[model samples]
Target: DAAPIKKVSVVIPVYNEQESLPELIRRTTTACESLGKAWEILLIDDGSSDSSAELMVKASQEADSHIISILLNRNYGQHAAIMAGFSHVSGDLIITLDADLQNPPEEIPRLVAKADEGFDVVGTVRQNRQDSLFRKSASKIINLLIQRTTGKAMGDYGCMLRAYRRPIIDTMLRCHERSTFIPILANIFARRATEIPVHHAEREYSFMRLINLMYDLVTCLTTTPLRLLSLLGSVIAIGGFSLSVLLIVLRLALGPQWAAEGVFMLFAVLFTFIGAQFIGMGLLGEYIGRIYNDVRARPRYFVQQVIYPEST
Candidate 1:
C-alpha cells in the first residue's frame, strides 16, 4: 500500500548552533510525530564553523528518513537560508523556526492549526522578550517604523517562528534579494497574515550574532534611516534659505552693516550649498544602488548541496 504524502513541511535554519542542535532535533521530531500527519524536516546549514553540519547530518541519518539537509557555500544569514529552504520544499504548508531553543517546538501545532484555518502566514509574537534592553528597544523601534511606513500591522515583525502556505512562500522567494527582509517580504506579498502571542525564554546561545543581525537588518531591510536623513536635510535647507533671505532684506533696508560681514556669510552660504549637494548625492546613491542590483538580477541565494530521501 502506498503511504499518504505529507501535508506540512517544517524548515529550520541552523547556524553555529552545535550546542542546541541535539535538543532541538529531539523536541522538533517529537512534536511533529505527535501530530499524526505526514511531515518532513528541512534543515538549512548556513556554513557553521562548528560541528553543527556534521551533527545535523548524523541526526538526519539516525532520525526519521524524511529528514533532509541543505548546506550552503557560506554563512548567508537566516533570510537567505530560509529562501533556499523554500525553493526546495515540497510540502503544502511550510513552517520556519529558529534552531535556538528560544522558540518552543510545542508551539508548532498551534501555528499549523492557524494555517489550516485559511491564514496564509501565521507568526508568533513574543509576549515577553528575553533579550536585553537595547535589543528590545531596537526591535520595538523597527516594528513601529515598519508599521508606519508599510501600513501593515504586525505585532512582532522580527519574530522568526511562523507558518506560511506553500504558495505564498513560493511567491515571496521570487522577490527575495541579497539584502532580504523575510517578514517584510511575507507581509507585503502574502494574502493573509496574522500573529499569535507566544511565550519566550532567554536565549541559550550567544547574543553577538543577534546584535549584528539587528544592525544588518537596519541597513538592508528598512529605509527609515535614509528617510530620517532626508528629513533632516530638508529642515536644514529650509532654515538656511530663510536665513539667507533675511540677511539680504536687512542689508537692503537697514544698511549693509545689518547683514553679516566678511566671509561669515560667504562661509554660511557655502556650507549650506555643500550640505544640500551632499544630501542630494546620498539620496541619489541609494536609489541608484538599488537599481543596479535589480538590473543585475542575480540569484538571491545559492545552495551548496542537498540531501533527500530517495523516494522524494
Candidate 2:
C-alpha cells in the first residue's frame, strides 16, 4: 500500500497557554478528523514559562500519531514560533492558529475551502472583537497605518488564524527576519490571499501580555514612524530655506528696513538650522539601525527539538 496523502498541517504556536492547550487540541483534532484527510497538528512551544510545553508534549504522545511538537530555546515571539512550525511542516496545506481560543478551531474548514479556490493564503477577520476598548482602538490605528503604508488591503494584520498552501508557506520561510510581520510577509510572498469574517472571543489570558505583543510588533515591522520623521525633517528644512531666501531678498530689494535685524531674525535662523540638523540626524540614525539589524544575520529562531515518526 502507498503512503497516505497529507491534506493539511495545522500549526498552533503556544506561549504560556497551559489552560487552553487541552481544549485547543481537542477542538483541532475533531476539526481535522471531520475533514477525513491526513492531517498533522504541530504544537510549537515558544519557550512558555508555564507548563504549556510539558502539557503539549504529553498531549502529543497520547494523541494521534500525526500530532507533533517543536520546542524552541526561548520565546522568540509569535512570528518566530510560526516560522519554527513552518520549518517542520510537510503537509500539502498549512494552517496557523493561536492557542488562546480567540481563534476558533471550527473555522479551519472554511479557511481550507478558501485555500482550495486558488487562493494561496486565507486569513480571518474578527467580526466582533473581545479586547478592551483601548486595545481595540489601538489595533484599528495600527491596521490602518499598515494598510496605508504597505498598500495592502488587510482587514486584520494581527489575526493569527490563517491558512496557506505549501508553495506560499515555502516562499515565506525564505524571508528570514528576526522582527517579522507574518501577515505582511505572506502578502508579499503569496500569489493570492483573502480574508474571511470570523468571530473573536475574549481571551482567558491577561491583557497586559497582548499589549506588550503589540508594542513588539510595531517595533519590528513597518518603518512608518521613521519615515514620518524623515518627511517632517525635509519639510522643516525647506521652510527654513524659504524663509532665509525671503530674508535675503528683502535685505537686498528693500534694504535693512524690510528685513528685521533684531532677535526675531536670529531666532528664526537658529530654529531653521536646528530643525534641519535634527531631521537629518533622525533619518541617518534610522538607516544605520536598519543596517545594523541586517548585518547581525541572526536566525529568526533556533529549534531545540523536533519529534516525528521514523517510518518511511
Candidate 3:
C-alpha cells in the first residue's frame, strides 16, 4: 500500500468464453461501478476461435463502455495474455482475473482494499471452489508443484483474482522469461504479499498446456534441477564401477559356475547406467530448450487491434 489509490484496473484474459462474457461483463461492471472510483476493464482476446473476439468488440462500443478490448495475433498462452493486459493498464492498482468467472470479479474491491493495507501483492484464496473432483485434484497437484518451484506456499495458484501494486506490476512486466507462471513470477519479487479467502464459482471440470505450465514453474523459479542432474550422473558412475568390482569378487570366491552369474550383474549395471543417463539427459534437454525459447526473444503476445472507450 502506497498512497491513496485514485483508480483501479481490472484485466480479464479471454479465450473461448463467448457464452460467459455477457454475464461476466454485467457482473464485472456492476462490481466496478459500485466502488465509485475511476476504473477500466481490459479484455484480452487470446486468439479465440469462438465468438469471444466478436463479443468483446461489441462490448467495447456498447453504451457506457468501461471495457477496452484487445485482440491478439495468436494464442500465446494465458500468462502472455495477462502480461499484455498489464502493459496497457494505467491504474495505480491492477487486478487480474479469468474470463470464465470462476473467480468472481466482485472480489476486486476487497483485493484493492487489501493492497491499501500495505501489501505489495494481494492474492485470493478460493473457498469451496465449484470445480469437480478431478479438477480439484489436478489443481492441487499443480499448486503443489508451483509451491515447490517458487519456495512459497500459494494457497491456490489456480485462482486468478490477484492484485498487484503499480511498481510490482511494472517490475513483473520487465521479466522476459518465456515460460512465465504470472502469479509466482510476481510474488517472487514482491516486497510484502498476502492472500484473502474469496468466493470461487465452480468451473465445470475441464493438456500440452500442462507441459508449458510445468516448464514455467521449473524454469522461472530455479536451476537446481540441472544441478541435481549433474550430481546424479556422478553417483551413477561411481556406483556402477563399484558394483562391477564387487560382482567380479563374488565370481572369484564362488568359482566358474558362479562366474556365469556375473552376466546378470553386468546386465543390471548396464541397464541402470543407461536408464539413469536417459532420465538425466531428458531433464537437461528440457532446461536447454527453455533457454533456447527465451533467447529467441519473440514477442510473448501480439496485439491485433485495440478498441477504446470512444471507439464504440
Candidate 4:
C-alpha cells in the first residue's frame, strides 16, 4: 500500500504570502499534472492578514477538484496550520510545504517519487541554500540538536518540504502533541525515512520561529535540558563543597589574611548556587506552562472555512 501512492495531498500552510501564491499554484499544478496522478493542493490559511484568504477562495473557485483552500480562525503558527489541514486530507500520500516559495513547488515530483519507493517519510535537505549565514548556522545547530535528542538523522529539520504515507500521517495525528515539531515527531513513527537534496530559494525568514522550534525540541522531544540542569547542579554542589573545605583549611592556616577574601568567596558561591536554582525553576516553569495547555487537551487550530469542489 505504501509503495503505490495512488492519491497525493500537497498541504501548503499559508501566512502572509500574497505575492507568491499565484506562482506557487502555477508551479504546483505543472509538477502534479505532469505526474499524471490524482493530486490536490490544500492551501491552509492560518489567519493571514493579507488577501491570502480571498485569493485562495478565488483560486478554489476556478481551481478544479485538485485545489482545497482552508482558512483558520486565527494565526496559530505554521505547524498548527499543517495539523489543521491534515484532518481534512483525503490523499494516500501527504506532502507539506510552506507557501513562501523557498521550497520550490517544481521539486514536488522528486519528493513524491522518493516516497513511492516504499519509504514511510521523505524530507528534503536544501542544497545551495539561500539563507543568510546566521540562519544557516542556527539551522545546523538546531538540526544537530534534533538529530541527537531524537536519535533521528533528519538532514534538514528546518525545511517544511516533506512527504509521508497515509499511515505515517495518521500516526502523527494520533500523537496529539500540542506543539507539533513535524520532522522530529514524524521520525518517531517512521520506520523508513530518508532525505533527498532539493532546491531552495531566498525568501523572508523569521528568527523567532527558529527559537520556537528549539524550545519545542527541548521540551517535547527530550528531557535533556532538565537532565542537564540536574547534572549541572550536581557538579556545582560537589565543586562548591570541595572549595569550601579548602577555604576553611586556608582560613585556619592563614588566620585574618585568608578571612579577608573568604567572605567574598562565600558570597560568590552562594550566588552561583541560587542562580542555578532560579534557572532550573525557570525551565520548570516553561515545562509547566506547556503541561497546563496539554492537560486541557484543546484542538491545536480552529478552521474558519474550507473551500473545495463539492463545497462550492
TM-scores for every predicted model? 0.75, 0.74, 0.74, 0.77
Q: How far is candidate 1 from the true structure (C-alpha RMSD, Å)?
A: 8.1
Query: Which window of 10 residues has the lowest lDDT sum in candidate 4?
Result: 296-305
- Of candidate 2, the 10-residue stretch with the lowest lDDT total is 296-305
Query: Worst 10-residue stretch by lDDT in candidate 1?
Result: 296-305
Clash pairs (backbone) in predicted model 1: none
Q: Give one digit per residue, the lDDT tens place, for model 3 in 186-282.
A: 7666667787887665544116765665666666556667666656766777777777777778768885565467687877589568757956786
Per-residue lDDT tens digits of candidate 2, residues 1-312? 222235899888888887887788888889988887778889888888988888877877883457898999997877677888889998988888878887789998887777767787787788766667887787788777666654556777767788877766777776665656777766665556678898867643367877776776676555557667667777777777787778778778978873446556676677688778778877787987688568734335435369999989
- All candidates: CA RMSD (Å): 8.1, 7.9, 8.7, 8.4
Q: For residues 1-312, write the lDDT of model 4, one tens digit per residue.
A: 445888889898888989998998898888899877898889999898989999999999992547888888998887788888999999998988777787778888888788778888887887765667887786777777777765678767667888888877776777665655777777776677788887666545466866776676666655545546656666676676667677777778986564368676686588568657856875786687667557746334425468778854
For all candidates in order, the CA lDDT equals: 0.75, 0.75, 0.77, 0.77
Q: Which should have the higher TM-score, number 2 or number 4?
A: 4
Worst lDDT 10-window in candidate 3: 296-305
How well does candidate 4 score on lDDT at residue 104? 77
lDDT of 4 at 247: 72
**Global local distance difference test of model 2:** 0.75
- Candidate 3 regions with alpha-carbon error over 4 angstroms: 47-58, 62-64, 73-76, 130-145, 148-151, 203-212, 247-312
Candidate 2 segments exceeding 4 Å error = 1-6, 48-54, 73-76, 130-134, 149-151, 202-261, 282-312
